[PDB]
Amino acid sequence: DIQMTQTTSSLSASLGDRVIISCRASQDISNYLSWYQQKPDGTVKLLIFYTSKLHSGVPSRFSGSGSGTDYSLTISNLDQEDIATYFCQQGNTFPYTFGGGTKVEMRRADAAPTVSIFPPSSEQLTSGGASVVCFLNNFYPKDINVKWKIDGSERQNGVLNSWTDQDSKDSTYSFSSTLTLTKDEYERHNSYTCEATHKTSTSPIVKSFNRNEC
Amino acid sequence: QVQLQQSGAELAEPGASVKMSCKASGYTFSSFWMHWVKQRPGQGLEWIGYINPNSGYTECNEIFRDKATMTADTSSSTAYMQLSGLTSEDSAVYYCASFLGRGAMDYWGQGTSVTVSSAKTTAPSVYPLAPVCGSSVTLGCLVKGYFPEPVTLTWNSGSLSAGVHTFPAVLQSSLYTLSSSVTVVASTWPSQSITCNVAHPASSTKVDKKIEP
């Protein structure tokens, strides 16, 4: 099978910028390469077929070029609604194969996350089990790491994380981390700390609470 | 005005089978091939194969030879795909796409999610999240241990939308968990009441959780 590879999985760009997305095939695919846009909500559109042919209904900003093994889509004058993921697809031979995709995100000034920690609710504790939730909201860029410290030690065991899509109004991301314990384990330790390391500050942003204290 | 409408989300136990539809409109369904694409959560696009709706002939990627069978009802302009011998690796969104020609697929359906688990329908536990005993304050809501997706969450019945971050659900011991934060001015809570409205339709669940301390 033909392997398609988009070397860059993600890139950033500001409105009006020219974005060039690259795609490479293991073998010569005789100019039978198409480009698709997928939006955050799963919508898929065809943009370009046969390397450089504009599909009906799609704007002239999109254009495609290439031959042999190397091909590239080009967005001129990036529009807000162009923030999406772009896949290439050879149609020269079966089975049809796609590239891994290239996400396009808006550029933004760096931003520090607002961090909030929450103790387990009284409701949850009645069932046994205790969840400590930490919200890190409205930060840029997207890369971020969270360390759950209990009593000076990282639990790094019963944690679940969830990320948001880039926000439409402002180009920040958000992050939810939840540490779940048994009510027995929860009630054996006292401090519960949520540590976030971000590019904007060399010193990790720390939020915590003591179960006993109030 | 080409449109492909696919059937709703499918839930099936391991080893079972599912069958999804893709109804075409805006073109002559018989004269064009229908393709099928698989996409796993957070992953890329995988090509299953195509069917010639007028002749029933099909070609598949070697992967999905035994797994998928494509059919087509020309009287209702509908293409079907059946997944059989379901595993967790079959859980994904499955797209139908009409064939443009020139090795390209010109119109795509919205996708049909398929989830394969042994879980049974379970109501969520809605837990309030208040800060520990300061110009702005952030409250939260933890929706833990429900099945299946989806759930709908709103703050004050949707009166608060800006400054709300609802997070995509995650799998937690074969059940789903979800959380949501809302941010308001510190001078407006607890002075005014903020409530988390959670609805799980698959269980007729409608919880309203206020946050007090």
Next chain:
Amino acid sequence: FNLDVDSPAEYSGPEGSYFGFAVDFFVPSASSRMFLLVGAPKANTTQPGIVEGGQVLKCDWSSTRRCQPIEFDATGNRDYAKDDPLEFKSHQWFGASVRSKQDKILACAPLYHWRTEMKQEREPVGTCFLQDGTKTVEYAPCRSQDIDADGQGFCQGGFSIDFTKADRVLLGGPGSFYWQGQLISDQVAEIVSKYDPNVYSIKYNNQLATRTAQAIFDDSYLGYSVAVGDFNGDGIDDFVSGVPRAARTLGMVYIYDGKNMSSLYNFTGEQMAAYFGFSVAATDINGDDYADVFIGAPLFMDRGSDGKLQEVGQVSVSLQRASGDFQTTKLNGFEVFARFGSAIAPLGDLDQDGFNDIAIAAPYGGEDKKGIVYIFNGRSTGLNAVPSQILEGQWAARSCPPSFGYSMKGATDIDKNGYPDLIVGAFGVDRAILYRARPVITVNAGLEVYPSILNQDNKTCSLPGTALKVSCFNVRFCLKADGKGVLPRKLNFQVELLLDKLKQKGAIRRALFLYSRSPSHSKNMTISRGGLMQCEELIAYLRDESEFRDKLTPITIFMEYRLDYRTAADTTGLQPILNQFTPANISRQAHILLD
């Protein structure tokens, strides 16, 4: 009867090109000049690498009868890859069918082959080109992804075509679905707006198409011929199509709803392999605003006076009725193996009498297979079963039969003289002929003989010179005429009267004219259109009883009136003609009184 056959307009194309295989009129939407469209499907073109690609020629009228090709497509074959043609345009028969509606011209190549993108094939899906004005687009509705004989690979889309009054196309593809055949209908708006040359199979919204059916319907040839007309009274033209191999070679004609392609009506032939459905036409022939169906079965065999089967051809006439039924009548050919009914052309109202008319061709009749076209006039009861005119081809060929009449098109008043005119193609001699309809003069004639009863004994008149006492009576003949369309104000009539016309060779004629003393009296006359009843009286008498002993048979007074056609010409050179359906002779009779 009023078509001018003495000096028609004759058009020729390149030898062997089948110039005249298809003909139509072109009436651009600017009230501009009018032209003839003539298909020459075997003509060589300048398309690189293409042999006998065919062409459609636009022919001027009254400007030295010149034709020039219409440039639908200057290009040769597109490549799928080096030395791997995507399509094959040679011998594609472009111009086998040509239809025009206002600015638009539609012409098809039913033998265009296409390779497909998956495999190296040569599938005769057929293609058409639609020229709306400045813009020209390809239209190959059978060049789909439904490959091979079981699909639309051998559809030969464009084998027959037509336009609806609401600017839909009707396309016949006799090869689809193992030769079940297929009808396809697309809005012209879709055909031009959805056109993308980068896409070989175009998705037209609102396309209407018949569907694949059970294998028992294979090899039926749906779409061999098509016509359009409303048959459920909803104002939307419906689709009529000949299916000549259907019903195990009896032949059938299907009518589908022009709104959803639902099946409305069916006709079925009566005889094995008569090729029932080779041609179809729809036109209101009896003036009730309900379209009537015409179906040609050119190979239909008749039983002769000796009981031997004889292939003469047969056309059926189905008068539509408000009740949804049809009132069918059959019309038989005249010459053996002439294939009466190969072509059926609505003429409009050829003679402008109130009822539309129709031409039916027998392309292999005549002397030395020259070909013959029969004109049938309509009337409130249906079609007049006796043809009022017979057009005869004038050329012979040394390879294939001339086939004069194989294609025809009427219902267009090209010379603006008030009457529709007729194009006749003769592809076997690379010829096409336009016949202009002459105008029709209707004449009202009255003949009065007074006294009706004649008494020999009663003598009140004196003979010429110095003679006396003859029994006399008065004969008064009157003439009035009018016409429609460009016509001369004054008409020169020649009238003749004959007394006692009953008595033939060698028999005494009892009545004689007073002055002439002969039983005949000629008279030139002159009357103007819409004028009054210009009359003239003269006096006749009887012979002496001694000269004839037949006093029993009545004495008929016969009147004839004809026209000299040269004197009534026009700037076009088009002499008018007398209405053939009103008799140009009238007779009264007097009686001898008996005692």
Next chain:
Amino acid sequence: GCALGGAETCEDCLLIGPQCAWCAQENGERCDTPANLLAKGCQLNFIENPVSQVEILKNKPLSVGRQKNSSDIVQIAPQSLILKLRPGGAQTLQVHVRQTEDYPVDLYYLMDLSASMDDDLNTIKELGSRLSKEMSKLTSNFRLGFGSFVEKPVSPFVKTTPEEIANPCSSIPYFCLPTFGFKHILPLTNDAERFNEIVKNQKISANIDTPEGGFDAIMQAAVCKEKIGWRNDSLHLLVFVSDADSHFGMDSKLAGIVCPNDGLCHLDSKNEYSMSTVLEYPTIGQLIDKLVQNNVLLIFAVTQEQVHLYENYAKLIPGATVGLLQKDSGNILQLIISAYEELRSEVELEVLGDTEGLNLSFTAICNNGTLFQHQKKCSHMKVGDTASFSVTVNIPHCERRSRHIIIKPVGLGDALELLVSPECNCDCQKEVEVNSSKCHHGNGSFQCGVCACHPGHMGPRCESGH
């Protein structure tokens, strides 16, 4: 009765009825039934009204028993007549037919060779010798030939790709020869082993669409007398072997072939039909014309799915019959013998030639005397039995030319030649006596007891000048 308007001339009197008469001199109604003319006094010598008559020119008796000499065979009696027919009236010819005990037989095996007929080839490897062995019990002069057909080798009926043209079965895969219209492979011969040899060496072909081009081959086999080798004075059995329906007439229009079949022989140097890609398929009317003209008896040996269709075709084709053929031709021998045996137990009359415009009535007299039927055929007769027919002929009007007509049995060469020469004149019309004294000192000619006036004179004796 016969007296009516006009009828003032002998010739004009004859036209109004066959039973009318004329008068002369004794004495304007001289035209009437002869009884009426006798009643009002017209002498017998005057009338001379013509009556239809038959002259026998050749009436050799029907041969009886096996004839060691071909020239002594006589299967239709009489062999030549002249018929002088008065218009309006009819004459009834008595025709007699007896089949000879040993009549030569020609059989042309015309076989569909498309891809579903390969099994059929395998089971007929020894049909030639099997068939000729059986036919030897029935005739001492059996000859058989072989021909094959598939389809016009043009688009859209065949694939036009290089691979498919070279081997239209390369897709299966299977070895097939390029598609071909009609191959005439072996003229009729006595040598049955030779027929076996070519059958064994035949290879199938293929094409796309179900209906095949046999009608092209049928037409060619019927008209190519010399190359096929039909001999005079023998049965001509054309055995059409196929498992499919047939293209006809303007089906070829799909392939751009729009010039009608011409009914002529077109076998090239390879003995292949050369106009296959040039001329339309035949029409039924065209096939009837040439099958009758060449005295060919067509036998549709076709499969169950096609039998009803070909029976309907056979209804229109004189002498044609249908046999139900197995999927492998396993029973083709029995089909042939049955058709031949049926043909040898029948006698059907035919009337060829200048016949348009005549009225013809047929009464068949089978079993010598007992049976009278209003048909032109006698069935269930033993070879040697005689079938007689009353052929009534009427000419509705007068005519100048005579008519050359042939009355013969279907399939057999013995023919009754018939000349029909209508009589519309009266013997008295050739003694004009111009400028006669009778018609007022030469103002008219005295023809048949009446005055025919000169121009410028009117009256019964031309006594008034105009």
